[PDB]
Amino acid sequence: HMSISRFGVNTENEDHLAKELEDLNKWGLNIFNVAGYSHNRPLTCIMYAIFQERDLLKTFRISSDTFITYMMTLEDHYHSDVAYHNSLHAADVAQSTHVLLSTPALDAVFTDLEILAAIFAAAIHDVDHPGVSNQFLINTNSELALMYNDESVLENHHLAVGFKLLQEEHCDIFMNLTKKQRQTLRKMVIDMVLATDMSKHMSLLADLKTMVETKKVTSSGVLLLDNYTDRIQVLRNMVHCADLSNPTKSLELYRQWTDRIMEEFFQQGDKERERGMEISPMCDKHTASVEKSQVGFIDYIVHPLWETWADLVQPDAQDILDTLEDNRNWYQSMIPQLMEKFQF
Ligand SMILES: O=C(O)Cc1ccc(Nc2nc(-c3cccc(Cl)c3)nc(C3CC3)n2)cc1
Ligand SMILES: [Mg+2]
Ligand code: NA
Ligand SMILES: [Zn+2]
């Protein structure tokens, strides 16, 4: 029971886990190892480590036992057999969001409640993901698309599941928040998860560009944000950036993530084919070109996003940008010798 107290998870390798978690505050954390040494409970482990590191459990009076119970059922509601959108991906976005919240240009800009909302949003943002895209769910007239009227169908679902889990007995981690804190937290979390809908990517990016065009900083380089509206706009872009962070990690990590997203796409493609539908872009293992698509993904989606975020917080994200360019160069080099999914 002491290593649960220390880690929030059972582990046969306490020492290895602890050494991996020394990188908790770094972009170079290896979440695959964390999964390895945590009996495959990366989200519970990384969330417990994050909440301990930021004193969130103290500040908001969240019982660590109730937290672990909530995080274990949340993590169970991610599907192990979905190749990318499983609890490892959620863990990674939560850890990446945790690192982005400490970027020096944002120092002291956000409230504690904002910090809590963003990390919690990251943790729940893909829960109960079925391994197929919104468009597939819309095209197959699925119950989820009927329920949510084709609008941010999975994202609404992730939120509903995340919040419904809080009403299970013994799982309400926010019980000691005041009513006003619970209301505010709820609104911010909804906002941020809905912002992870890829079809909002271009509108988010445009808004973010306006914020770069108008940015002002103190003479120490800290961003000056005027009101709630400015801050939530940065936080929704932050979570969106963390969700699209895989190509800004070390190549060894990025390649693992790409193998996973492609397996997931190919599995959807097989579903589409089994039922005689036209196979979606990227989902046909026969015609796919993994390297070229990554290069396209970076050039048209990931790079423009991160170049703008980098402009907003400069110079704090320059290295993340350098890695993203370097990785683009690697994928480009391995080519043998999209856009509608991110718009409307
Ligand atoms: O599947 C969707 O409809 C929305 C979506 C799009 C992209 C992602 N993530 C992702 N998407 C791609 C990707 C690559 C090429 C084309 C397209 Cl549409 C997406 N590549 C990667 C690499 C970083 C691991 N990740 C997740 C969800
Ligand atoms: Mg999602
Ligand atoms: Na599960
Ligand atoms: Zn995600």
Whose alpha carbon is nearest atom 2 of ligand 1? 133
Asked whether the CA dihedral 85, 87, 88, 91 is positive or negative, the reply is positive
Residue 128 marked in a binding site = no
Count other C-beta atoms under 10 Å from residue 270's C-beta.
14
- Residues with active-site annotation: 85
C-alpha 247/C-alpha 323 separation (Å) is: 8
Q: How far is the CA of 49 from the centre of ligand 4 (A)?
A: 20
Question: Is 89 annotated as contributing to ligand binding?
Answer: yes
290 in Cβ contact with 113 (< 8 Å)? no
Tokens of 64: 């660590």
Which residue's alpha carbon is nearest to atom 11 within ligand 1? 261
- Give the residue carrying structure tokens 């009101």: 227
Max CA distance (Å), the chain: 61
Q: Which CATH number fits domain 1-344: 3.40.50.720, 1.10.1300.10, 3.30.70.1150, 1.10.630.10?
A: 1.10.1300.10
Dihedral, 305, 309, 315, 316 alpha carbons, nearest 10: -110
User: What distance in Å separates the CA atoms of residue 275 and residue 283, rounded to the nearest whole number?
Assistant: 14
Helix or strand (DSSP H, E) at 45: helix 42-53
CA-CA distance, 199 to 197, in Å (whole number)? 5
Q: Does 297 belong to an annotated binding site?
A: yes
Cα 14 to chain centroid, rounded: 26
Instruction: Identify the helix (H) or strand (E) that includes residue 2.
Output: helix 2-7
Residues, Cβ < 5 Å to ion ligand 4: 126, 243
Minimal-distance CA residue to ligand 1 atom 5: 198
Nearest-5° Cα angle at 155, 269 to 325 = 70
Q: State residue 223 phi and psi, 5-degree precision.
A: -60, 140
Of 135, 153, 255, 297, the residue with max ligand 1 atoms within 8 A of its CB, to mutate for a pocket test, comes to: 297
d(CA 69, CA 174): 13
Ligand nearest to the CA of 85: 4
Measuring CA to CA, which residue among 275, 268, 325 is closest to residue 299? 325
CA of 313 from ligand 4 middle (Å) equals: 23
Question: Residue 129 is which amino acid?
Answer: H
182, exposed or middle or buried, with CB in 10 Å at 0-12, 13-18, 19+?
Answer: middle
Q: Which atom of ligand 1 has the smallest separation from the CA of 338? A: 18
* Residue ranges lining ligand 1, Cβ < 6 Å: 133, 198, 246-247, 257-258, 261, 282, 293-294, 297, 338, 341
In sequence order, which residues have a C-beta less than 8 Å from that of residue 8 and are 6 or more positions away? 44, 45, 47, 48, 49, 64, 67, 68, 71
Which residue, judged by its Cα, is nearest atom 22 of ligand 1?
A: 258
Q: Tokens in use for 253?
A: 């990590």
How is 146-169 classified by DSSP, letter by letter? HHHTTSSHHHHHHHHHHHHHTTST
Exp. method: X-ray
Q: How far apart are CA 215 and CA 52, in angstroms?
A: 33
Rounded Cα gap, residues 46 and 16, in angstroms: 14
- Residue 61 is given by DSSP the state T
What is the rounded CA–CA span in Å between residue 328 and residue 332?
A: 6
Instruction: Kindly give the interhelix angle for 112-124 and 228-243, rounded to the nearest 10 degrees.
Output: 30
Question: Can you tell me the distance from the alpha carbon of 225 to that of 235, in angstroms, rounded to the nearest whole number?
Answer: 12
10 Å Cβ neighbour count for 329? 13
- Give the H or E element holding residue 236: helix 228-243
Mutation test residue for ligand 1: of 32, 134, 261, 298, the one with most atoms within 8 Å of CB: 261
Which ligand has an atom closest to residue 41 CA?
3
Considering only CA atoms, which residue is closest to atom 10 of ligand 1? 261
Please name which ligand lies nearest the alpha carbon of 158: 2
Count the alpha carbons within 13 Å of 37 in the hemisphere toward its beta carbon: 16
Alpha-carbon distance of 71 to 47, in angstroms, equals 8
Determine contact, residues 129/82, Cβ cutoff 8 Å: yes
- Virtual CA dihedral for 227, 196, 190, 207, nearest 10 degrees? 30
